[PDB]
Amino acid sequence: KVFGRCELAAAMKRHGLDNYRGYSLGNWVCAAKFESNFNTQATNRNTDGSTDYGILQINSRWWCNDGRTPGSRNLCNIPCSALLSSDITASVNCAKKIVSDGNGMNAWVAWRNRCKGTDVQAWIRGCRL
């Protein structure tokens, strides 16, 4: 499913991402916008033959198993297909693991290049307090 902006903000906030590891809700919404356009079914192949899955484009090289990424690790202990559900619970739990891994949200290349240092508050303007 394709989330609305405020719909996704409310879901991310309900699952505890607002200021998780110090990253305000606008950072997560912005990241989702540029990784997936808010589309839980988004899949994109990386040059190394891994694939990124879901609303936060979680990568099969380290975090989920898709059975076709040699050397895969599956640190979130999930099939990558579970990251495409209309329920973002698995994506958010896995994102908590990723962002705690030491490098913060720089793990999401699109966040580093398109959200970092920008007015991310704009991404939650209109959601309900």
CATH code (residue 43) = 1.10.530.10
119 is in an annotated binding site: no
Residue 97 belongs to what H/E stretch?
helix 89-99
Catalytic residue from among 18, 52, 66, 87: 52
Q: Can you tell me which residue has the tokens 């996704």?
A: 8
73 contacts 98 by C-beta, under 8 angstroms: no
> Considering Cα of 39, then 96, then 44, then 123, what sign does the dihedral take?
positive
18 given a catalytic annotation: no
**From which experimental method does this structure derive?**
X-ray
The count of structural domains within the chain is 1
Q: Between helices 5-14 and 25-36, what is the axis angle to 10°?
A: 130
Q: How far apart are CA 81 and CA 58, in angstroms?
A: 11
76 contacts 40 by C-beta, under 8 angstroms: no
Catalytic residue from among 7, 35, 87, 119: 35
Quick one: tokens of 48?
């190394």
Burial 58-80 (b: 16+ CB within 10 A, else e): bbbbbbbbbeebeebebebebbb
7 given a catalytic annotation: no
